[PDB]
Amino acid sequence: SVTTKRYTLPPLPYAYNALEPYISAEIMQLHHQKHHQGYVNGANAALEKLEKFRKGEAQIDIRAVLRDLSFHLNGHILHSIFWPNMAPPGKGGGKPGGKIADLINKFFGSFEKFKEEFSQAAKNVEGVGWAILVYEPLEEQLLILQIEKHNLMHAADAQVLLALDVWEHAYYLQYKNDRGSYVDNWWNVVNWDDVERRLQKALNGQIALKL
Amino acid sequence: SVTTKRYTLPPLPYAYNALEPYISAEIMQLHHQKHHQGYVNGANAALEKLEKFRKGEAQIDIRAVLRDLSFHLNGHILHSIFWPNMAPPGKGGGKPGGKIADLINKFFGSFEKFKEEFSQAAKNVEGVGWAILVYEPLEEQLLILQIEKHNLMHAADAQVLLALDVWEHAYYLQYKNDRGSYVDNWWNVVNWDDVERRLQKALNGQIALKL
Amino acid sequence: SVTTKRYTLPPLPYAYNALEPYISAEIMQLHHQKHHQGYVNGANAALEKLEKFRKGEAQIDIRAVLRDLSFHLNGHILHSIFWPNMAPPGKGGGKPGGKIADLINKFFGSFEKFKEEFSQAAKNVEGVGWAILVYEPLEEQLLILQIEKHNLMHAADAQVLLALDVWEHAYYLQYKNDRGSYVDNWWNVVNWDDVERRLQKALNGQIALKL
Amino acid sequence: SVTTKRYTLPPLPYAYNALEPYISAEIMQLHHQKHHQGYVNGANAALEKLEKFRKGEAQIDIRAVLRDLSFHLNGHILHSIFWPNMAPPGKGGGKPGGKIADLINKFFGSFEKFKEEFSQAAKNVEGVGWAILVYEPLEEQLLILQIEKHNLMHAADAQVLLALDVWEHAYYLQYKNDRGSYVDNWWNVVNWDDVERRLQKALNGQIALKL
């Protein structure tokens, strides 16, 4: 009668040390195996409370549980995008070509200016959060957003094409307090094929999470 | 070399008095003409700052503007979905039908369990916000979420199918502090024909807009 | 043994129509009997869950209950300060004198500038919240702060001297969406004797409550 | 003429290695020199913008700057309390005594229970934040609260007695993702005599700073 779909941790698209020297192998493991894994569990934990409520098996503090859901569900959605959003230098890094390159110049004027806006947004996230590029469906335009925690300030219905995680656990062991150096080096592992992939879908008015 | 798409206030699908005595014509007028117009304006003002920045004609407080943009943009998107999510009683109200009646019963067990979860999320919003129903694309399931202000707690990439505004200006003039009764009466105007259309687009792997 | 002190709704320092034509009696009535009461209620409810928890008598989602407590407790504290912060025209309105007038000139240049900063802080709160003037103990200076909801952005240890509620239920019935007109008119009922007493307590290194 | 009072980084009460093995000297150094210095700097940076606005020397995005001031000011105040809140094993650690130990039993029943409520609040702060024990003046009782970032959820006028920093930079280099071990190991350096004195102030209806 009542059914909820559960989440699972996606395997990384590469080896934990594949992004070195930009992101340490130890961070990659902790980030993937501990942090991302925790969001998957948190999402299911909240979903199970909701199912128990829906089955009439228990009451519920809907505000608390839905806050839990949003936080965890987003941590998971964003980390799922983050991993394939990167790749070993070669497949990753460099300048973008294709539609993503076109649209970037169109809305930002140049790749460099796009990097400035995105990198500055990432470096200036207050507390933990992300810097992301989304395709805005309503008026069809690229927009860079700052995200606090994992769920604050997303554009309703918008599709995340590229995300940069600036939660301290995403860089501290390697870069320490120097988030800025992390943000700058990260450009060396960005997978534009992945981003172009998602842009291809969003451009057609599609959701661009899978593939 | 740099462009930013602007937003405009969408026309209501009906007269202001269309939802009475569920939502007064005064509230409908203010909410739309004043409040919603404000969000369109705020979003555009933020873009103007970004456009200037991207052109190099000016600097920018990226955190400030991205926080601004996120707020107003969501205010605009959610209200644009909010209006067609309702209709003059007869065309609005009743119960769900179609793929949405099927999914609601699938994930919640019944329409009454759904109405209970959604209504409680709405009534239990802390401060000003919304109670929404979205299609979650990663595990393809329907979820109800609480949104604080206009931009807090959205699920990245998810498609908003049904939105219920619980900001005081959506009900106070009529129901005063009784947000609970505002919530209960609201179901008598829900345009389930609109929600179904949105779910159909969502299921096609499309964005729940422009349809 | 375990005991928690509970909160109670304090009486207004004047009748429900004492602030007209600046704040209608209906607003004052609702805001006091319904809203403020709701916060007192919320704080005690949260404390009853904590007490049960401390008596080993129950379990607890510490994040959910402490989030509830902080919001409601601040709602109560701020409203408790808000009522005596005003007074029927005569005792309220005009410019400040005594120490507060002095400190205001010292830190803002003049009362006119202060009122500018304060009104703009209040007119620009995003969503519901407050504009508050506090005495910063650490470095001894006046500061105006924006508060979102009742608990977001307060300065640790600081003493609230003057509070202006910009939640819609504090002005909507009369000013509708013109919060600005509301804020401008609010200066006519500001009980500067109250502000002064609180500042003097702060200056004394004391908590600015109870007179 | 307007003046603002600037903030300065306070020296630690002990050597950087003075709290090992519980908190590494690298953390202490980075935490103090980079992070705390950043908040003081950020607080002052906001004051500079506020100062010229008051001197009619420029315009101001009041929401932007007051949001900035709240975050940085709180970071400075809370860290300023955080440092003396700890002490090298000997002067720090063990259980409380005097008034604080006595009050912890009144409101929590036992030190054991208090430790559970405080530990659970700190381990369960969503994102980055603090767990704090304050003295709530209005009804005169000990309350534990969760703080997100440095400025969300504080209780107006409340005096912070003991603060625990759970921002990842406060532990990640040593404890990695295990916030739980960090929280548990921290008690071993708590300066109960400090919490005692601040409680004395609060009990004296005074502000708990500069002593």
The secondary structure element, H or E, covering residue B147 is strand B141-148
Q: Is D152 helix (H, G, I), strand (E, B) or coil?
A: strand
Closest C-alpha to C66, from A48, D128, A64: A64
Cite the DSSP H helix spans in D31-136.
37-54, 62-82, 98-108, 111-123
Residue with tokens 């990640």: D172
Residues of C in contact with B126 (CB under 8 A): 71, 149
Residue with tokens 């409340």: D158
Residue in D34, D71, D168 closest to A168 by CB: D168
In sign, the C-alpha dihedral spanning D32, D34, D37, D43 is negative
- In DSSP terms, D86 is beta-bridged to D190
Cα dihedral C141, C145, C150, C153, rounded to 10, equals -90
Q: How far apart, in whole angstroms, are the C-alpha atoms of residue B151 and residue A29? A: 32
Residue D125 tokens, joined: 């702060």
Q: How was this structure determined?
A: X-ray
Q: What angle do CA B160, B161, B162 make, to 5 degrees?
A: 100
CATH superfamily of C24-87: Fe,Mn superoxide dismutase (SOD) domain (1.10.287.990)
Residues of A in contact with B125 (CB under 8 A): 63
Q: Does residue C126 sit at the B interface (CB-CB below 8 Å)?
A: yes
The secondary structure element, H or E, covering residue D144 is strand D141-148
Q: In chain A, positions 33-72, which contact chain C (CB-CB < 8 Å)?
A: 61, 63-64, 67
CA closest to C124 among chain D residues: D63
Query: Is B169 among the annotated ligand-binding positions?
Result: yes
CB-CB under 8 Å, A177 with D35: yes
Residues of B in contact with C182 (CB under 8 A): none
CATH superfamily of A88-211: Iron/manganese superoxide dismutase, C-terminal domain (3.55.40.20)
Residues of chain A with CATH 1.10.287.990: 24-87
DSSP state at residue D160: E
Amino acid of residue C150: H
Amino acid of residue B53: F
**Percentage helix, strand, coil, to 5, in chain D?**
50, 15, 35
**CA dist list (Å): C63 to C69, D125, D127:** 10, 7, 12
The secondary structure element, H or E, covering residue B131 is strand B129-136
Q: Does residue B113 sit at the A interface (CB-CB below 8 Å)?
A: yes
Q: How far apart, in whole angstroms, are the C-alpha atoms of residue C133 and residue C165? A: 12
> How many CA atoms, within 13 angstroms, populate the side-chain half-sphere of residue C54?
25
Q: How far apart, in whole angstroms, are the C-alpha atoms of residue A32 and residue C170? A: 47
Roughly what angle, to the nearest 10 degrees, separates helices B179-186 and B111-123?
150
Residue in A50, A109, A157 closest to B159 by CB: A157
Residues A146-157 as b/e (b if ≥16 CB within 10 A, e otherwise) read bbbbbbbbbbbb
Count residue pairs from A and C with Cβ separation < 8 A. 9
Residue A55 tokens, joined: 């089955």
Q: Is the bond into D96 cis (omega within 30 degrees of 0)?
A: no
Residues of C in contact with B67 (CB under 8 A): 126
Residues of C in contact with D2 (CB under 8 A): 106-109, 113
Rg for chain A, CA atoms, rounded: 18
Residue with tokens 């004027």: A109
Residue in C67, C139, C154 closest to D5 by CB: C139
Closest C-alpha to D108, from D144, D136, D140, D159: D144
Amino acid of residue B196: E
The secondary structure element, H or E, covering residue B120 is helix B111-123
Q: How far apart, in whole angstroms, are the C-alpha atoms of residue A192 and residue A199? A: 10
Q: Is C189 helix (H, G, I), strand (E, B) or coil?
A: coil
Cite the DSSP H helix spans in D83-146.
98-108, 111-123
CB-CB under 8 Å, D148 with A177: no
Residues D175-207 as b/e (b if ≥16 CB within 10 A, e otherwise) read bbbbbeebbebbbebbbbebbbbbbebbbebbb
Query: Is D169 among the annotated ligand-binding positions?
Result: yes
How far does the CA of residue A48 sit from the closest CA of chain C (Å)? 15
Q: How far apart, in whole angstroms, are the C-alpha atoms of residue B47 and residue B45? A: 5
Do residues D153 and C67 lie in contact, with contact meaning Cβ atoms separated by under 8 Å?
Answer: yes
- Sheet of A141-148: strand order equals A141-148, A129-136, A159-165
Resolution in A: 1.8
Q: How far apart, in whole angstroms, are the C-alpha atoms of residue C207 and residue A42? A: 41
**CA dist list (Å): D19 to B64, B111, B186, C141, D166:** 38, 58, 59, 34, 17
CB-CB under 8 Å, B2 with A209: no
Q: Which residues contact A110 (CB under 8 A, 6 or more apart)?
A: A104, B1
Do residues C77 and C47 lie in contact, with contact meaning Cβ atoms separated by under 8 Å?
Answer: no
| Residue A3 main-chain phi, psi, to 5 deg | -140, 140
State the best of A39, A151, A168, A175 to mutate against chain D, taking most chain D CBs within 10 Å: A168
Rg for chain B, CA atoms, rounded: 18
Extract the runs of DSSP E, i.e. beta strands, from chain C. Answer: 129-136, 141-148, 159-165
**CA dist list (Å): D56 to B60, C99, C114, C180:** 21, 23, 12, 22
In sign, the C-alpha dihedral spanning A129, A135, A140, A142 is positive
Q: How far apart, in whole angstroms, are the C-alpha atoms of residue D210 and residue C149? A: 30
Q: What angle do CA D43, D46, D52 make, to 5 degrees?
A: 140
**CA dist list (Å): C81 to C5, C141, C165, C202:** 19, 20, 10, 14
Do residues C208 and D207 lie in contact, with contact meaning Cβ atoms separated by under 8 Å?
Answer: no
Residues of C in contact with D141 (CB under 8 A): 4-5
- In DSSP terms, B163 is beta-bridged to B132
DSSP state at residue A35: I
Q: How far apart, in whole angstroms, are the C-alpha atoms of residue A32 and residue A82? A: 10
B50 alpha-carbon distance from chain centroid? 25
Closest C-alpha to B64, from A211, C101, D65: D65
Q: Is A161 helix (H, G, I), strand (E, B) or coil?
A: strand
